[PDB]
Design a protein around this ligand. Structure first.
Ligand SMILES: CCCCCCCCCCCCCC(=O)OC[C@H](COP(=O)(O)OCC[N+](C)(C)C)OC(=O)CCCCCCCCCCCCC
Ligand SMILES: CCCCCCCCCCCCCC(=O)OC[C@H](COP(=O)(O)OCC[N+](C)(C)C)OC(=O)CCCCCCCCCCCCC
Ligand SMILES: CCCCCCCCCCCCCC(=O)OC[C@H](COP(=O)(O)OCC[N+](C)(C)C)OC(=O)CCCCCCCCCCCCC
Ligand SMILES: CCCCCCCCCCCCCC(=O)OC[C@H](COP(=O)(O)OCC[N+](C)(C)C)OC(=O)CCCCCCCCCCCCC
Ligand SMILES: CCCCCCCCCCCCCC(=O)OC[C@H](COP(=O)(O)OCC[N+](C)(C)C)OC(=O)CCCCCCCCCCCCC
Ligand SMILES: CCCCCCCCCCCCCC(=O)OC[C@H](COP(=O)(O)OCC[N+](C)(C)C)OC(=O)CCCCCCCCCCCCC
Ligand SMILES: CCCCCCCCCCCCCC(=O)OC[C@H](COP(=O)(O)OCC[N+](C)(C)C)OC(=O)CCCCCCCCCCCCC
Ligand SMILES: CCCCCCCCCCCCCC(=O)OC[C@H](COP(=O)(O)OCC[N+](C)(C)C)OC(=O)CCCCCCCCCCCCC
Ligand SMILES: CCCCCCCCCCCCCC(=O)OC[C@H](COP(=O)(O)OCC[N+](C)(C)C)OC(=O)CCCCCCCCCCCCC
Ligand SMILES: CCCCCCCCCCCCCC(=O)OC[C@H](COP(=O)(O)OCC[N+](C)(C)C)OC(=O)CCCCCCCCCCCCC
Ligand SMILES: C[C@H](CCC(=O)NCCC[N+](C)(C)CCCS(=O)(=O)[O-])[C@H]1CC[C@H]2[C@@H]3[C@H](O)C[C@@H]4C[C@H](O)CC[C@]4(C)[C@H]3C[C@H](O)[C@]12C
Ligand SMILES: C[C@H](CCC(=O)NCCC[N+](C)(C)CCCS(=O)(=O)[O-])[C@H]1CC[C@H]2[C@@H]3[C@H](O)C[C@@H]4C[C@H](O)CC[C@]4(C)[C@H]3C[C@H](O)[C@]12C
Ligand SMILES: C[C@H](CCC(=O)NCCC[N+](C)(C)CCCS(=O)(=O)[O-])[C@H]1CC[C@H]2[C@@H]3[C@H](O)C[C@@H]4C[C@H](O)CC[C@]4(C)[C@H]3C[C@H](O)[C@]12C
Ligand SMILES: C[C@H](CCC(=O)NCCC[N+](C)(C)CCCS(=O)(=O)[O-])[C@H]1CC[C@H]2[C@@H]3[C@H](O)C[C@@H]4C[C@H](O)CC[C@]4(C)[C@H]3C[C@H](O)[C@]12C
Lengths: 241, 241, 241, 241
């Protein structure tokens, strides 16, 4: 806090700043979707490859700026910690072989979420219900793990594509949980060899399904036992006073 | 408003009018479903091709009439703006090659919704919940867009049917969202070439699913935090008075 | 009402009666499931074919009896009107070619629902929510009908198995509504010929899905705006008195 | 209750005890997942086969101990009755041919549920909603049974894989209930021979679906008519006093 600090802070904290970024984002958003056509890249492919590190430099400056204005507060903000890591990726140079990072650059278009406050709101609402589910996700993951281990031991030797491995079996059990091809694609083939295999997967389909449904019912029915306490408290008070 | 205006207004606004239309609709409804059989069209196919522009002329008159009675109010009514556009299509002449318009004529059977007030009610109820979802639809569409761009770049070269293009990838990601063949039909083929592809689509299946469920829970649990404010307000008042 | 009438009424209305029937039902239930094995029918197949019209005669008597005791009240009771029609079928003689009626006999095992009061309760609960949905089922059926007509006209010539006919198209559109193979099995084949076919089925999948979800939300959120009126009425009263 | 009894009781009831078990569990959990790789078992396969009956003996002692401390109370506790039966299996010797029991040993990893109180909580919540559903599960199972019998009689001769048998038909009807391949995989093949087969499976798909949805709505809407009685009772009381 001083003369020079405050000068920057008023740039960074301005609405022009955030809108310039939001524009860059929507602009580089469109550019990244045009960068998708081989036709376009043969023609205008240099313009957008240059338009790209333009936005990357701007976003780096813009991040640098925000870290000066916000100090340690910046690395405790989940919203901006994101932009940090998402612009960080987009800075790793395109020449190192690893395809996964060149494509990671598109993750910068998620700044439109952190930048726009209406978007931040939804994400925070959606994220907010996760912490209560951690217990049930742990139970479910344990349940998957126990069953993935059993299926490997039961079906992996004859059915190695689907169950040869703790991971192949995790994958198949998830597919079964999504109910996708679970009978025609998986369990019926299984039963030509293991006639009682339906005794494994139907109860799995029952339990995994039952938990999913209850999880939702618990959310709804618990989210509104709370509104019914608040409201009686506000009703008990006006009948006393 | 005058002698001549009021004469028409009493025709248009009558219940005979709306019922005559509702009858024409249900009648041309049935005719359009009989127009479906080649057998029937070989025999009675002229009767119904003529019965058709009969209804079209009537409906045009009927629309003309309603515009005189209702003035500028007509082009601010969503319900009637529809019948306008839906009869407008049915007027474009059958001879111009474009198959899409000849079939559009069946959209006139949706006038049974605008005509019948019980139907209008449901549609308005269903439409009414959309405006609050616009934020989440925007988030989801952005999310699809970011992922459609990544998948094109990741899988389009080897898997051009499913991911060769921003649109092919949109399509596949929607199919994956519907969970249809997502593992047997898509992700398992993908993994013969891209062993880690499950790292893209499971989290996509998780996020897209999670949002869908939360959207519903939000509707229910928010639609009824409101009833719990109204009711305490009506309870706080009678304990004060 | 008299000496002779009352004698029968006390048989019919007894608990021994209903339990004898409930036993016959569970007994003929088991018999009808054993009648399923060719092995068993080669051995004991006469015992159960005779055990069958035994139960049929008993059930006819039992129905006759109940009609005397209950008079016109019997043909206004949905529960017993059922047993009437379900035993009526089981009386039509096995020799007339029509396979559909021989198998209809198994419908008598549904008397265990009408007989047992715990069962009647659920069915009445489940049936009870249907009447409010009649509007939306009508809207949906109209919507299917309009779209089934369009799809026949659009895809039936090249794709006659799936869309050759108003009924083939109804069937496919339902399958699409269940999301079953909708993309791999139907819409993707369609698009090799009709590249824009996704413009028909995605919006269909959107609308049909949207309505389904809203129907449920409406049930829940409306079933409990009522409990919130009852309860404020009971709360407003005790604050007045 | 005495000097010697109390000495053991203070071991068993200690937190060190339960944590030692919880550690053994998570340790043997990891071991059972490593026991999955043929690579690992070629190397360290003896260490973990020995680490296994180590844990089994400990768990037997640990169970013996708990039965002394808890007396008849132990065989009335569902939580510990489980560990009993789950360690009991793991004690049956690996040499008797029956593959099903060697794999059952993994069920011991479910002790992490009974051991950890956060886990016990969820399971008890989830289990708690089952008793009210027993009626509807009975109705559904009856409904399946009636339909499984009809389908065997209707489609089993031509379609023995799917409907040759009361059990094959149960299986298929469940698959149809999960909607998995129900049209492409089952009903469409059926209709090449039985053109009206859609008259069996669509109503089955309707009823079975309808019940599922209503079951959930009943849970939610009934779980919270109760909160609305409790809260008015607590509101009626403070307006009287
Ligand atoms: C969130 C996004 C996560 C997506 C990760 C999965 C996608 C994926 O595997 O994409 C392919 C890349 C790069 O190819 P890679 O798997 O290295 O080689 C494939 C074999 N080839 C080139 C010789 C035909 O593979 C990787 O990037 C592997 C990353 C781990
Ligand atoms: C309510 C929500 C309930 C969620 C319950 C848990 C869901 C787990 C979802 C399944 C995850 C999955 O696909 O696991 C695969 C991985 C890696 O196995 P891997 O053998 O590398 O790959 C399998 C496919 N292959 C052979 C063709 C390359 O296997 C693993 O490494 C296990 C990953 C477990 C993640 C748990 C997250 C929660
Ligand atoms: C009861 C409490 C339990 C708590 C502990 C849970 C965590 C234990 C982790 C154990 C990891 C075991 C890894 C493992 O076995 O790797 C298997 C394979 C590699 O097999 P590999 O040895 O390469 O090939 C063997 C030869 N072959 C090809 C002929 C079969 O590679 C794979 O399949 C990948 C490994 C996937 C691991 C998934 C871990 C899920 C964690 C769930 C935690 C639940 C907590 C509540
Ligand atoms: C909760 C609700 C969440 C909804 C999230 C967004 C859902 C998007 C659904 C997917 C739409 C879709 O199929 O996009 C296809 C189009 C056109 O691509 P196009 O390459 O013309 O056609 C693909 C198929 N082909 C090559 C065989 C002709 O691709 C586009 O042009 C993109 C259309 C985006 C529409 C977004 C509507 C919301
Ligand atoms: C971060 C903020 C982002 C905001 C901006 C979002 C809108 C950007 C629109 C970009 C449109 C890009 C269109 C495009 O690249 O067309 C691709 C293809 C035509 O490819 P084409 O050049 O014919 O063929 C190349 C050669 N080949 C066949 C060998 C591959 O044709 C297609 O694939 C059809 C184009 C489908 C466009 C779908 C647009 C979805 C908009 C989502 C908006 C989300 C807002 C929150
Ligand atoms: C509720 C239950 C409704 C079930 C109706 C659909 C079942 C179905 O179609 O079952 C087959 C029967 C009898 O066979 P049907 O369709 O008369 O002849 C098949 C051709 N064949 C014998 C020469 C191979 O077909 C019928 O029973 C047709 C009934 C209309
Ligand atoms: C929320 C609930 C929304 C429900 C909306 C309506 C659902 C309609 C479900 C579809 C019914 C269906 O499969 O229709 C087929 C029939 C008969 O067509 P048909 O050509 O006899 O048989 C088609 C199959 N084939 C050629 C192999 C024999 O086609 C018809 O005859 C039409 C039947 C319409 C029944 C509407 C019931 C409501
Ligand atoms: C806008 C208001 C509308 C209100 C009226 C709705 C009811 C209209 C009923 C019209 C019935 C039309 C029947 C019809 O066209 O039959 C078509 C086929 C028989 O075709 P066919 O003439 O044997 O074969 C022609 C030659 N071929 C094989 C080369 C194509 O056979 C079939 O496809 C069976 C017919 C299925 C009829 C389904 C009716 C659904 C009613 C939905 C009502 C919604 C009300 C809100
Ligand atoms: C809401 C919840 C609604 C639940 C309604 C009931 C769901 C029943 C689920 C279907 C169970 C199932 O798959 O049944 C199969 C068994 C055994 O038949 P089986 O012939 O041994 O095996 C069939 C497969 N095969 C020939 C390849 C070996 O068939 C039986 O033995 C019947 C088992 C009935 C269990 C009912 C549990 C409730
Ligand atoms: C209306 C009240 C009803 C209450 C009673 C319900 C229980 C009745 C149980 C009847 C059990 C019938 C067993 C049976 O028939 O076994 C059939 C097959 C064995 O056939 P099999 O004789 O080996 O082979 C015949 C020759 N072949 C291969 C050429 C066809 O093997 C199988 O398919 C396995 C048997 C599966 C039985 C599933 C039982 C479900 C119980 C549902 C109870 C609902 C209660 C509300
Ligand atoms: C009961 C179940 C499962 C855990 C269990 O059964 N034990 C858990 C999992 C998700 C949890 C809810 C969400 O977190 C949202 C919200 C957060 C607030 O902070 C407290 C209220 C509320 C409604 C939570 C209540 C409850 O905790 C839920 C339903
Ligand atoms: C919270 C979520 C997602 C948006 C977000 O999380 N931000 C949004 C999306 C759909 C929205 C509801 C519907 O619109 C129906 C209705 C309209 C009324 O006008 C106000 C009340 C109500 C219940 C809305 C509340 C809330 O706004 C919802 C649940
Ligand atoms: C609003 C929607 C759709 C119709 C529409 O939007 N118009 C309709 C369809 C199903 C209807 C409910 C059920 O019938 C059960 C119940 C019957 C009682 O009698 C009155 C209350 C309740 C909760 C009904 C309220 C409402 O009527 C619902 C939600
Ligand atoms: C009405 C339906 C179906 C049975 C039927 O309709 N008859 C049944 C099946 C599941 C039942 C609920 C659960 O058990 C959970 C809970 C247990 C409490 O103890 C009492 C309250 C509550 C909410 C139950 C209410 C009701 O009983 C339900 C909804």
């Amino acid at each position: 806090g001083s003369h020079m600090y405050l000068r920057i802070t008023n740039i960074v904290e301005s609405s022009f700043f955030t809108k310039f970024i939001i524009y860059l984002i929507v602009l580089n958003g469109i550019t990244m979707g045009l960068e998708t056509s081989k036709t376009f890249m043969q023609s205008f492919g240099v313009y957008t490859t240059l338009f790209n590190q333009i936005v990357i430099t701007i976003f780096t400056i813009e991040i640098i700026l925000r870290i000066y204005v916000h100090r340690i507060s910046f690395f405790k903000d989940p919203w901006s910690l994101f932009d940090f890591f998402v612009v960080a990726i987009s800075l790793v140079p395109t020449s190192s072989g690893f395809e996964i990072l060149r494509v990671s650059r598109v993750l910068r278009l998620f700044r439109l979420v952190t930048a726009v406050p209406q978007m931040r709101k939804i994400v925070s609402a959606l994220i907010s219900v996760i912490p209560g589910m951690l217990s049930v996700i742990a139970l479910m993951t344990l349940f998957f793990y126990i069953f993935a281990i059993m299926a490997t031991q039961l079906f992996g030797e004859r059915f190695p594509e689907w169950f040869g491995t703790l991971g192949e079996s995790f994958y198949t059990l998830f597919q079964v949980m999504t109910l996708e091809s679970w009978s025609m694609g998986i369990v019926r083939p299984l039963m030509e060899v293991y006639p009682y295999a339906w005794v494994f997967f139907i109860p799995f389909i029952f339990v995994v399904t039952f938990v999913m449904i209850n999880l939702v019912v618990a959310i709804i029915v618990d989210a509104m036992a709370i509104l019914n306490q608040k409201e009686e408290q506000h009703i008990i008070d006006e009948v006393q006073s």
